[PDB]
Design a protein around this ligand. Structure first.
Ligand SMILES: Cc1cc2nc3c(=O)[nH]c(=O)nc-3n(C[C@H](O)[C@H](O)[C@H](O)COP(=O)(O)OP(=O)(O)OC[C@H]3O[C@@H](n4cnc5c(N)ncnc54)[C@H](O)[C@@H]3O)c2cc1C
Ligand SMILES: CCOC(=O)NC(=O)c1ccsc1NC(=O)c1nc2ccccc2s1
Length: 452
């Protein structure tokens, strides 16, 4: 065990605050610190911290305690018959994925990076490429052990007594207490590969049409890269990547002897950089269209889920240092309003190169869960004069159109905007006050967003 004064930021490397960081692989030492925060006064409290991949301020607590959960990383059991994994909250999804593949089990929700803790995944109720077919992370938790303000460990499940606290903890940003341990139901798989279809659209209207033609129901996974810089009609054109997990019959013979195995970058070889005389004219368009259009292509995890790994030190000049990540969802029916927000973005003078578009499916019952059925987009803006004031206008537009921002990608929204975006906030706050009357759990985010 060590306790250290530490300057913490989120992944965006902004809004720094100093906290006493506790780092111990001893679960009883964690209980004792919480018990101490609870007994001695009220104070500025405590917040859990995972791998620090949230862009915002939800895993810091200026002048209070931060409990680093990463050394609690025991996988206790995996069972192929029940499909259940029992894991400490500090286990990460990369570690879990590799540990579970030999059992023919797949992590049911994967984010854009595997460097996230199980606790972080639950507390942000993370989503991925299969949201429309599988929901978000919290949908797959069968039990969790929550260390609450009174220093007891409550065993929470999604149904029966304490369901309310379970669903307040899902997406609760650590503010109901410290998840120590959890059971996740995994997805059975016979391979570590995807079968994928690719389509490339010419415009925004084409991108939308493809996502509302009914074809989404044929694919368990689906996401798109999105042009946010070009003027219409090119604005909102997309490289759409859709697929499902392959079965072993669908693999080529060379891969069929290790169906479950998990298997030198572009800036090193074919760089610097990628452009030629063709790239920005009609041949480049044709090439782009033809290489992004395919059917029944076998891909590994890296190809299908982390296609940004191909580019190397190039993903350093697109974040995170002088960059502001911004993610929002607009309800399905507000299609015209979605197109309107995209127009506002391209004409703003703020140029976002990397844009992830996805159509979300049904929501779950967590009051603070980000995803709702509708048009989800993530953008990444260079930090520049006027950006802060422009994203405030974006906030207003998102709110007006019935949508919301993601707390994992936010450090600059107001309490007022957030509360209007999350109309079940009062219901959630009221659960939080029942389980933490003394405000033992607190973070910079809780104070900024008035969730304390
Ligand atoms: C490159 C990149 C790609 C990403 N892609 C996606 C994506 O596709 N989809 C998506 O949904 N998200 C995505 N994210 C966001 C990320 O998945 C979430 O922010 C996730 O919560 C971070 O997990 P973490 O362990 O780093 O948690 P941290 O960032 O350390 O903490 C996040 C929150 O979880 C809480 N928390 C952490 N551990 C515990 C615990 N043991 N008990 C209680 N509360 C806890 C913290 O208190 C904090 O409120 C991405 C982030 C990056 C940097
Ligand atoms: C679709 C896979 O995309 C990625 O490779 N992710 C990235 O590298 C990346 C880098 C910084 S932020 C980020 N990705 C994201 O924040 C993503 N959000 C969603 C939402 C739904 C479906 C897929 C994604 S990926």
């Amino acid at each position: 065990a060590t306790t250290t004064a530490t300057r913490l930021t989120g992944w965006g490397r902004t809004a720094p605050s100093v906290a006493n960081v506790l780092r111990t692989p001893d679960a009883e030492m964690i209980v004792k610190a919480v018990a101490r925060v609870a007994e001695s006064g009220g104070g500025r409290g405590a917040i859990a911290r995972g791998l620090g991949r949230s862009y915002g301020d939800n895993a810091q607590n200026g002048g209070g305690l931060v409990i680093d959960m990463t050394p609690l990383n025991t996988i206790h059991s995996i069972d192929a018959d029940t499909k259940l994994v029992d894991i400490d909250a500090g286990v990460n999804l990369d570690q879990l994925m590799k540990a579970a593949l030999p059992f023919g089990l797949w992590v049911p929700v994967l984010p854009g990076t595997r460097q996230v803790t199980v606790g972080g995944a639950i507390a942000c109720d993370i989503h991925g490429k299969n949201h429309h077919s599988a929901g978000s992370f919290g949908n797959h938790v069968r039990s969790m052990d929550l260390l609450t303000a009174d220093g007891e460990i409550r065993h929470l499940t999604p149904t029966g007594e304490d369901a309310e606290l379970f669903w307040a903890t899902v997406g609760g940003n650590g503010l109901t207490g410290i998840i120590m341990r959890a059971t996740i139901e995994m997805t059975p798989t016979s391979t570590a590969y995807f079968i994928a279809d690719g389509d490339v659209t010419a415009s925004l209207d084409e991108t939308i049409a493809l996502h509302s033609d009914g074809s989404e129901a044929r694919y368990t996974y689906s996401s798109a890269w999105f042009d946010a810089i070009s003027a219409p009609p090119k604005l909102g054109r997309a490289a759409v990547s859709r697929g499902r997990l392959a079965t072993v019959e669908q693999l080529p013979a060379k891969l069929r002897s290790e169906p479950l195995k998990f298997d030198l970058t572009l800036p090193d070889v074919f760089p610097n950089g990628l452009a030629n005389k063709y790239t920005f004219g009609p041949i480049g368009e044709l090439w782009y269209r033809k290489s992004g259009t395919y059917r029944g292509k076998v891909q590994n995890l890296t190809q299908f889920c982390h296609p940004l790994d191909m580019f190397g030190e190039w993903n350093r000049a697109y974040g995170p240092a002088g960059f502001l990540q911004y993610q929002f969802v607009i309800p399905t029916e507000a299609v015209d309003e979605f197109k309107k927000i995209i127009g506002v973005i391209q004409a703003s003078g703020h140029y976002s190169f990397l844009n992830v578009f996805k159509l979300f499916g049904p929501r779950n019952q967590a009051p603070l869960s980000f995803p709702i059925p509708g048009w989800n987009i993530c953008v990444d803006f260079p930090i520049k004069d006027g950006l802060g004031k422009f994203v405030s206008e974006l906030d207003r537009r998102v709110l007006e159109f019935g949508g919301r921002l993601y707390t994992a990608k936010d450090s600059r929204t107001t309490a007022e905007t957030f509360h209007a975006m999350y109309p079940r906030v009062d219901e959630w706050i009221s659960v939080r006050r029942k389980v933490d009357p003394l405000r033992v759990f607190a973070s910079d985010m809780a104070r900024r967003l008035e969730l304390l």
